[PDB]
Amino acid sequence: IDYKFWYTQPVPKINDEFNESVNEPFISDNKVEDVRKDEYKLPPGYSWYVCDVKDEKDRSEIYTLLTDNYVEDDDNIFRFNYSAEFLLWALTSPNYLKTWHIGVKYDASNKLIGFISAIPTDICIHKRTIKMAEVNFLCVHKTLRSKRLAPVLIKEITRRINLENIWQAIYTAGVYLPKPVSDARYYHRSINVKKLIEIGFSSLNSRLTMSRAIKLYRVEDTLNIKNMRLMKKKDVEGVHKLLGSYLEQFNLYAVFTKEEIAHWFLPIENVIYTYVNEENGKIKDMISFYSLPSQILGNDKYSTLNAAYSFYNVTTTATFKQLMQDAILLAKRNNFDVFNALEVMQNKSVFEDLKFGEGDGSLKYYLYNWKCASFAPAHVGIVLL
């Protein structure tokens, strides 16, 4: 595979190896003055569209495009189905720009056929803090694949991010591109095991009968940390200190302001779940997970897999194992079928004892225009949506 597009870009070549002594841009001294003011050209019959994510109709068009054309599993049974309310939350964080929510319409039918988006955040990479763009939800309609529209969308969002004097981005993908700074597998913890088997997400074996699998994944409906409760606005300062202080140990992590903590953590039903343990007016433990369902295609019984994805979890009054056992419990109480986590932060250490199973492939973390040492995923301290 040649990466004829990617090799024109400020990113590492497949064989590039940098020491820990290197931690800087590939291209520095960039000038907002010099950024191209013209939109990149689209094939005949197609146009840029500025998406207003706070307009329910524009949002619903993005929602439809992703519902029909986003990430599918290797066998093509499952397709991610981010909710409209989810997309609102994911793309209207503090200081977001409307002009980084970019669609492409096919003129003749006025239908949206392409999308890419970014949001601004401060990213600390090997102890340097850089204002970056966080790029997500790149999607080209399934009918228009391998026509090189993705590189158009990418060069256009790059241009619009550069116009804000920002020159670095972070992004994740399942595909291998030049070149991951880290690489983390998904692990899956079955909650509704019979449904997971019936939809073909998990399996059994003569060793393991349906009843025995159900017993294996059975959980006690009692928290290790008995006062774990939904987060509220009063807990923003406390979570800002607990999470902020925790994250500083990692090689890569978002440096959250208090406004960002409110946005990213305050709970939204069917979007984001954050629980806290408050002890003497201090927040001492937190659990958070987000809702990302998969549409189940062509099943007579089920149309939706409800999945909870581990987001940020910190404990100071229990073991990490006990905290994540509580996270699984909290996802079960909210009627989630499976709890997913990446082998980042301290997550791997709990996967065997908590009966997680290893997933297929992995999620690659990337930076744009940044040269640095790569590292093991335990050193990663950021989870993108």
Ligand SMILES: CCCCCCCCCCCCCC(=O)CSCCNC(=O)CCNC(=O)[C@H](O)C(C)(C)COP(=O)(O)OP(=O)(O)OC[C@H]1O[C@@H](n2cnc3c(N)ncnc32)[C@H](O)[C@@H]1OP(=O)(O)O
């Ligand atoms: C300073 C600011 C900088 C801002 C930008 C930072 C960079 C942000 C980068 C974006 C981060 C997104 C992160 C994200 O959203 C989360 S990862 C999920 C991405 N979305 C999907 O998988 C949805 C299902 N697939 C599709 O919609 C299409 O297959 C897409 C649109 C993905 C590719 O459409 P297509 O019809 O299949 O392909 P062509 O148009 O013919 O394009 C082929 C070229 O596309 C390169 N490609 C393929 N998949 C990619 C991927 N996931 N990242 C980056 N590049 C990807 C590919 O390597 C090749 O270049 P090469 O010839 O060099 O290999």
Ligand SMILES: Cc1nn(C)c(C)c1NS(=O)(=O)c1c(Cl)cc(-c2ccnc(N3CCNCC3)c2)cc1Cl
């Ligand atoms: C049930 C189901 N529904 N679908 C759609 C799939 C693929 C599955 N199978 S899975 O659950 O076992 C699983 C899971 Cl959770 C996640 C990844 C993974 C791979 C690559 N990229 C991303 N992202 C890209 C951008 N940020 C969002 C995450 C996720 C792969 C698998 Cl295979």
Ligand SMILES: [Cl-]
């Ligand atoms: Cl060009």
Ligand SMILES: [Mg+2]
């Ligand atoms: Mg294409």
